[PDB]
Design a binder for these strands. Sequence first.
RNA 1: AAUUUCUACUAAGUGUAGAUC
Length: 1209
Amino acid sequence: AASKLEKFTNCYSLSKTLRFKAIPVGKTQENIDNKRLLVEDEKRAEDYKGVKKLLDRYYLSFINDVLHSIKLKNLNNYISLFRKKTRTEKENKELENLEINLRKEIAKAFKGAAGYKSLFKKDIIETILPEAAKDEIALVNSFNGFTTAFTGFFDNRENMFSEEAKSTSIAFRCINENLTRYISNMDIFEKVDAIFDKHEVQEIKEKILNSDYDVEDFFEGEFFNFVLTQEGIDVYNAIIGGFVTESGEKIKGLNEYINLYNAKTKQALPKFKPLYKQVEGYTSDEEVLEVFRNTLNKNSEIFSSIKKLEKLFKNFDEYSSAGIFVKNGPAISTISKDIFGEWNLIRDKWNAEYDDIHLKKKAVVTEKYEDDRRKSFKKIGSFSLEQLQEYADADLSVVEKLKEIIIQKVDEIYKVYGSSEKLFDADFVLEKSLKKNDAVVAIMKDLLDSVKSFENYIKAFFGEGKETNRDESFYGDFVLAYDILLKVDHIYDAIRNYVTQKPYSKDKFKLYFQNPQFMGGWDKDKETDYRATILRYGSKYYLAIMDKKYAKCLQKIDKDDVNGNYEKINYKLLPGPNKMLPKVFFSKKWMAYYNPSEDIQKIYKNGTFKKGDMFNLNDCHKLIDFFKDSISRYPKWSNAYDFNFSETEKYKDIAGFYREVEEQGYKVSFESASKKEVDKLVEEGKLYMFQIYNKDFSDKSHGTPNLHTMYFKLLFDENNHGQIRLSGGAELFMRRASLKKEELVVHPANSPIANKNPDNPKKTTTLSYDVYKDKRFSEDQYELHIPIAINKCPKNIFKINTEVRVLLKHDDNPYVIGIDRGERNLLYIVVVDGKGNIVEQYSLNEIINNFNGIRIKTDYHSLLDKKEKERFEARQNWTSIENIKELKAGYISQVVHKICELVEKYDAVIALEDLNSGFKNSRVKVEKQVYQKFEKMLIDKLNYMVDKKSNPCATGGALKGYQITNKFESFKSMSTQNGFIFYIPAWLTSKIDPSTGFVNLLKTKYTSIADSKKFISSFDRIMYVPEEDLFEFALDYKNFSRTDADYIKKWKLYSYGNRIRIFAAAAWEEVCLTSAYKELFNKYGINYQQGDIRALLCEQSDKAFYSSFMALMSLMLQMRNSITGRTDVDFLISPVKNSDGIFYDSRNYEAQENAILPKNADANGAYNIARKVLWAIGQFKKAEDEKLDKVKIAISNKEWLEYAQTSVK
RNA sequence: AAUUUCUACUAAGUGUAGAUC
Ligand SMILES: [Mg+2]
Ligand SMILES: [Mg+2]
């Protein structure tokens, strides 16, 4: 009988690496320099990039051994089934499986033969690179035994040969890029054949381009395989584009000839598309500038492609609107906005057309119907200009409005060129430095942006076809030009990364000290081989590295008593008992030293001790006892570890025994070694010594330590059985300094420094010593990464999701933490009990820190506000944008802690937005990409949640962290449920009356006067109430469309309260309700004491009554009201009364402590996100224990409104 | 404006609060 969290400790193992600074002690650094130990590791760091290029060389020769040798069998059917003019009906589906097998055939041809094995293993730079193609053999030699360097590279490069359908894959480049273009050129070649003079075709082209083959050949389908390799690609593209001839001659390609057939001026005869060949900036101001000048000046090719695209689109009318497509996705919203004037128009017209087909007059639109229709829209690949014009009202030519938009964008590039013109002068020199030159950086960004946006907008004109009749006459010119234009993407990114860079560098290189096996392990004596160990003196820890000539130097050292002793590390990790107990104890040396029995041998060889229905408990137990006894009689192990074994009988399986061996097969304590003696070893350079350090080891550190500091100390604390452990794979790095100390910004001693937190009541600080910006980057820095194992031997095994459900099922009053992102609040929190009562509500705009019993807050929302003003003053430059992103990422590391306390405090489950059902809205300040990061870190922390201020052995302290979450997988996997975390859709959580569950499901925009009458008439009643001085609209959501989700159906709307209206004016004004009705009715001669006035109201003859009656109605249903300037109120008022008679205003809760209902609209959202989890909990309470794992949690809008409206009481 | 590293700091004077492969 305890808390639900109590059950979640020692569940699964987790591994982490702690980093530290390593401070060289004494003469160590001098010795390191004299003996020149470092430079070995530093040049390798230099030539790493060089060797990588040589690896790419052999890779490219390889790719071209497999590609010369390949004949695609799948191909010949594929081409046919491709240009079959589809005819669809999923007959094409047959083909889309033929496609995948084209990539399948390529991948397997790589893997299948001519080696491929020896490619990403140690033997590629050992021997293979040396035998392939002196100044290059030398660099590779030379990395022998240091093959570690290329592992990240090795992973990045094996993705080349997959069937992955990624732009990484060679196969994808072959079939889904080159082959569609190769096919599309056949059909161009067939159509455009006779244009070619015999003297033009094979004459100049066959001889000068080849003298082998003929031009006809490369437009035959069986010839494609020839064009997989780069030569055949160059040959092909030279046929199209042209060729230099090796003399000045310059042979025209096919495209020039088609061009020269402008003589018929009908023209618009399609040109061929070239084939994709396959397989920046950033180091200096002079480089960055050289690229900008070179790629973006007015006779660059990017600027050439812009002029061609200007010419192309100027003739947009000349082309067939039926054969021009716009890719489906964001480009559809945008172009809808630019063409018609609204986002959802295209989507809306398309929904109007889908309905008519799928909407049976039995009707009632349901959630699934809307989900399925949505799945259909998304699935649609693209829209022709013709189809878009099909939605085009009269008066509005879609092509022409598009022309004026595109042309406009090119004119904006040309004006921006004019403003940047001096930058492209041969004469131009950079006076200041780039990161000191805001003006230049802004000139560059302006131009880059205007071209990037042009590029990014024009990209929409494909539709990934895979499409029927395309206007190849348009897509010839377009594709020629756009492939060039696209180069701006790379340039943009590189230049931006360079400006955005920190003024310092974190570049570093791994240290082996001329030792391939340096520091592989710790725990055991292999210390003569690994040559690194760990020393302790008082509170300080040290890393000690023995010189090769003196490995044993640490061996022989007295226990002293001259009053000076480092403590010295030893003892032992027994690694993987399950592999290692049988490898030792069945080794013939042991099978001599011991007998053993043949009953034991037979059990092992057959494996009657494992699982898998050959299991025999007694056979298993015999093995155990054999091992147990073998353990008594094996010195190496029984003088190392203190084995305390469970009775053999209470072992159910063999893993039970193995865990105990693993658990006890690790010791760790300390030896004793003369301080004076090793200190001298350092002096003589027999030993190199570094202090392992972070600021928490400073003699002036008095605060609560870093979490990782605790982990590290706890490694060697008596109270740690239980358990954090030290692991091998430690690495030492060198980080060369990147700032010069004399050049740092400094706050000089004895002068007040302004304090920056406006909520810090102390205004200045005066210290008696100097404070330096970024000081740590002005010194060469050694850094030490040490791997640790947490909960290596878990006792509690179970499924975390199932256990959470079971405990919630049997919890009589489970609390839920709701988190929501808000408009006036970065994050807002609502804690709720098992019945929906709010227990705690507040904004997380302010993070309050504790040190002593002193509290100081930081308002991160004001920070973001000052930085957004900064971004405005700086004209949205890159660096402010990065500053805002990082601020937010900082903020979320603060929030993670606030959530952990709340979980611990209320034993509560967490309710979070599912971001894969993504909506989002411009007003919320934490965007999706930051929130996703937040949700990942929340998960990461809940793998091992720890409160730093708890005593470490206590549950929830550093040796007993809560594990209430499984390991992160991906963002797509952040849905449904991860342990204590539940992912909820935000649908209908903010705009809903938390006291009745009323949500506005009507559509109140004026459309027509008939529609308005129908609307008014669909109401049950409209009656002015004299007693309560109110108008009462009584409705039945049945008589209105798309209201299926509502549960109560019958709702009496009233007037009381007022509302804030946009009133887009000469954009804010406010409006009292029940007095706006009185006004309007008087205005039109309608006496309203006469109710039911529905019939009456419909007697009105002009739009003006109706247009303003509807606008009035919309406001009554507008529950959320906000001024935007004033932080005071973003309130919620509801047009419907509860069972006790008065209705809900937010301002009546707006100032209290933790009210019973939400205080503003931000709260309501976090409150309702939490209630959906209560709903989910409610489903658990309905299921049997063994069914819990199966219960669905994806609440539907209909379940939600039923719950919101019935549970309130 | 100090950091294993990050963000926000100065937090009582070479650092503070979270977080951190
Ligand atoms: Mg600290
Ligand atoms: Mg900083």
